[PDB]
Amino acid sequence: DEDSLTKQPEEVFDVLEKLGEGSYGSVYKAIHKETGQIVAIKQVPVESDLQEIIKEISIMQQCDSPHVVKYYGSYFKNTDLWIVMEYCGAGSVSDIIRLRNKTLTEDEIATILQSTLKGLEYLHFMRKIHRDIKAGNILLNTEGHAKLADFGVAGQLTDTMAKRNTVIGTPFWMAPEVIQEIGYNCVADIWSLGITAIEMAEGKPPYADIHPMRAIFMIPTNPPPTFRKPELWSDNFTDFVKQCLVKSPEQRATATQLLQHPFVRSAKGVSILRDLINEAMDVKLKRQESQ
Amino acid sequence: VFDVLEKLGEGSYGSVYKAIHKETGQIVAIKQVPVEQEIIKEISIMQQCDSPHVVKYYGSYFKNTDLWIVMEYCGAGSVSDIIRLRNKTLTEDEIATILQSTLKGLEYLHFMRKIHRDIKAGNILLNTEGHAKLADFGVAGQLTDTMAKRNTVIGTPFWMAPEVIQEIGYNCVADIWSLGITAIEMAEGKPPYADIHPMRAIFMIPTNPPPTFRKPELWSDNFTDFVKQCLVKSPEQRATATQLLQHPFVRSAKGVSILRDLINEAMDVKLKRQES
Ligand SMILES: Clc1cccc(-c2c[nH]c3ncnc(N4CCOCC4)c23)c1
Ligand SMILES: Clc1cccc(-c2c[nH]c3ncnc(N4CCOCC4)c23)c1
Ligand SMILES: O=S(=O)(O)C[C@H](O)CNC1CCCCC1
């Protein structure tokens, strides 16, 4: 009766393994004991910038897209904030490359970036900049559907604010105009997508072995990066990356425009991700049999 | 050429492996970095240095496209690793002894017109005997007759001095600010602003008052004052390595013998984890 209303979070959820780091704390697999539903929970201590966390939650709540991780709700556990989210059972593309010790095929990249671009097209229409687009922040569910994750550093455009000027992101992936003092908008995410395309192909971004703070100073001045071995890759993939990595943000393609690029327009269904998913989660299950 | 063993970790800019010199049986560390000129800077600065408080340079080989740099091996690893492995922060007395050796390294570097620019627990090593040595000259800077200051914005954000972050030029005492943050890091387990985004922190350090301990009542007046003297915002006013070697917290520091248990526990937990 009245004993069901004050059940504490560690009584509602069965908390399992750490999945990785998020914006302002760690993320864990969990089961809703009642419904059997599986979820991800980011645990955030009270000494975090709680303004920014409410922003993240807010941006997630406003978004309703099969290409963006859903928000389910929040719980307090002592002073700790539990943020409860959609669980994607294959993990990040970063994890899947690491687990298999293999980069992705042109075909796998094409399909994943098409879903990623549909996410970006939704966000950009809703005047949201992600600002942290990389393989780390693109998730696959067991069915092979990609979802944008980690709105920790995301930015909002409004009637009175057509541009942001906050220098933020992960250096290697950050657009020149983000790094320079001038204001920027949604197409910053397209530059980051370009770097991510290279990251999935080659296993790391350009300048990956250089110091991050030396890279940030070079990106604005340097010509647009390209593949480490251009002759390995199709003309369509090479051109896709070239269209993403245009230095002038005014000239740079939109998510909508890039969805029509031959490399992406021609993309196969999620069925070509079946092997990639199965191998990854197999290597995961084997490594978990060291308990 | 030499017998390559386990990864020991990442540097700022390259992976580092244990190795044995096939000829002499001598044990060494090798940092592997691929090539896209600036790397020569690190090697150059390493060769110019000859100090028991700095990892010595042994030589270089290129293997495929990757340059392998051969360095002094310190068998206890980084202070960062030792705090993590034992899941314990360090006592005032352990910090005192380690930072005294660290300061003698800085005093040598600063006299040689070198700025390290990446001072943190990650980049302070102990050999098996418990002697501390400065590692990772990846982002290190050189002063000359016509260049009394650098202006390159570089380092690890949480640890970086305000004057380094601002466009104004800076000199050796940038390392002393970083040492202050490192003192807090070893005491508390993390730098200040640790639960903030790095790129938000970098913009706050110049404007914010000097960071302090999360729990002031836990720490001696000597340690509190040491950190306060390191974290002076004005680089002109900030103490030098030489001056801080005379600070009561450090001058009164015990021999390396108080590191014996810390070392033994750490390397034991390392050897156990390597059997799984
Ligand atoms: Cl705030 C944040 C940031 C990145 C990813 C997630 C996440 C949500 N649902 C997930 N399912 C599986 N794995 C996830 N990650 C957690 C972060 O490390 C990568 C895996 C997630 C959450
Ligand atoms: Cl470039 C660089 C940066 C930091 C440390 C080393 C290093 C040299 N000799 C070593 N012996 C033992 N452990 C070492 N670790 C410390 C932990 O991180 C990896 C390198 C080292 C090298
Ligand atoms: O899905 S669970 O979190 O386990 C169940 C929720 O805690 C239910 N909380 C409601 C609060 C308002 C009054 C009715 C109950």
Side-chain angles (χ1 to χ4, degrees), chain A residues 19-21 27 40 42 56 85-88 92 95 139 149-150:
Chain A
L19 297 175
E21 299 296 329
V27 182
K42 181 153 124 214
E56 163 166 31
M85 280 161 298
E86 190 181 347
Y87 174 70
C88 309
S92 64
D95 284 335
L139 303 185
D150 204 350

Side-chain angles (χ1 to χ4, degrees), chain A residues 24 52 153 169 209 211 213-214, chain B residues 34 139 155 195 197 200:
Chain A
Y24 296 68
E52 282 289 286
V153 299
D209 301 311
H211 196 281
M213 299 265 89
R214 171 146 171 85
Chain B
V139 301
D195 300 308
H197 194 281
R200 284 203 176 278

Side-chain angles (χ1 to χ4, degrees), chain A residues 17 53 57 67 69 112 157 169 175 187 190 195 202 211 217 220 275 289:
Chain A
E17 68 263 22
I53 294 290
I57 291 173
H67 310 295
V69 306
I112 288 170
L157 301 182
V187 292
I190 301 302
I195 301 300
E202 288 180 1
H211 196 281
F217 178 76
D275 285 348
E289 269 152 36

Side-chain angles (χ1 to χ4, degrees), chain B residues 8-11 16 29 42 71-74 77-78 81 123 125 135-136:
Chain B
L8 297 176
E10 312 284 35
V16 183
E42 163 166 34
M71 293 174 288
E72 183 178 344
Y73 176 70
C74 299
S78 68
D81 285 332
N123 293 333
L125 304 184
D136 202 341

Side-chain angles (χ1 to χ4, degrees), chain A residues 24 45 47-49 52 131 153 166-169 174 204 209-214 216, chain B residues 12 14 34 38 118 139 153-157 160 195-197 199-200 202-203:
Chain A
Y24 296 68
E47 312 97 2
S48 321
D49 211 287
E52 282 289 286
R131 291 204 284 202
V153 299
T166 310
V167 183
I168 195 161
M174 283 171 68
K204 325 163 296 197
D209 301 311
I210 281 181
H211 196 281
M213 299 265 89
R214 171 146 171 85
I216 283 185
Chain B
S12 60
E38 197 87 9
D118 208 8
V139 301
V153 185
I154 197 151
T156 312
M160 281 171 69
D195 300 308
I196 297 289
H197 194 281
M199 299 265 89
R200 284 203 176 278
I202 215 165
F203 272 76

